[PDB]
Amino acid sequence: AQRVKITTTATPGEIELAFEDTGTGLPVLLVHGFPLDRTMWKAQREELCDEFRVIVPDLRGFGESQVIPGVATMEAMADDLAGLCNHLGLTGKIVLGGLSMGGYVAFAFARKYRDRLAGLILCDTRARPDSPEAKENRRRVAERVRREGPGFIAEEMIPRLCCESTFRNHPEVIEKIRQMILSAPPEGVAAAALGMAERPDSTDLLPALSCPTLVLVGQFDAISPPEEMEAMARTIPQSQFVVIPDAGHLPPMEQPERVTQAIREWLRKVHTEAGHHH
């Protein structure tokens, strides 16, 4: 992995991001969820790099990236991604993928940087904004995590994040997810919780998308359910909708091969060398 100071149009104008960059060719940036880090996309990075260039950052406040106290808006996170691509000389089109919060970041990027997208991958995410009770819950999580750290988040969320078959067949995956949550910087978690509370509604963005979009969901996702994601896909032009069997909310980790294959086959259709040149 690398760590670089990037220039970003969001406050505070410069930020140090940790990231992985593996493979050559057409760029695919994959954005983790909340409270996660770049390692949640490790299987896809390590496999897709035979055919694509896979870039996987720790977002501001997460993993090994700089923590920026206050509010980390979805827009700011998207600005940081644009700045990372600028740093790397990836100033043409990319495919951008995200899971859950990472999907919220992808929407923010599509609003602002639509001309930089060859495609979008939306996994286990939602277009609606937070309800009032969800906003209040973000504030409560922020307040507490700053002081107590993320253990309470792991305790609440682990039983909800993955399907029963993952617990039974892949206890090592459960433990990796637990460690990922437990390691998340307290103030980074807080700043992102507050940022999520204030994200806009992306419902009307969806029909306005101008690139192919892959919509992926675990069969047993209780958090961003398949019925909701299917309904989302029906409003996105040039969508492909894929339900990953025997996965909950974290298909990339629970069913890594199925997710890698779904992404690979879709990328072959949408992210071509001739499109990069012209």
Q: Is the preceding peptide bond at 12 cis, omega within 30 degrees of 0? A: yes
Crossing angle of the two packed helices 186-197 and 132-148, in degrees rounded to 10: 170
Give me the residue spans of the domains in the chain: 1-278
Is the separation of the CB atoms in 235 and 224 below 8 Å? Answer: no
Residue closest to 129 by CA, chosen among 192, 197, 189, 78? 197
State CA 221 to chain mean position distance: 16
Is the separation of the CB atoms in 270 and 95 below 8 Å? Answer: yes
Alpha carbon distance 80, 15 (integer Å): 8
Q: State the amino acid at position 190 in one-letter form.
A: A
Which residues lie across from 119 on neighbouring strands?
95
Q: State the amino acid at position 227 in one-letter form.
A: E
- Could you tell me the two tokens for 47? 């496999």
DSSP state of 31: E
Resolution (A): 1.1
Which helix H or strand E contains 119, and what residues bound it? strand 117-123
Give, in order, the Cα–Cα distances in Å from 91 to each of 110, 147, 167, 168.
15, 40, 41, 44
Give, in order, the Cα–Cα distances in Å from 17 to each of 61, 190, 264.
9, 18, 26
State CA 65 to chain mean position distance: 15
**Are β-strands 53-57 and 14-22 bridged in parallel, bridged antiparallel, or unpaired?**
antiparallel
DSSP state of 58: P
For the 1-278 domain, the top CATH level (class) is alpha beta
Q: Is the preceding peptide bond at 35 cis, omega within 30 degrees of 0? A: yes
Residue closest to 233 by CA, chosen among 241, 224, 225, 222? 241
Alpha carbon distance 111, 239 (integer Å): 17
Q: What are phi and psi of 64, to 5 degrees?
A: -100, 10
First to last CA, the chain: 31
Q: Is 111 left (phi over 0), alpha (psi -120 to 50) or beta?
A: alpha
Q: 11 in helix, strand or coil?
A: coil
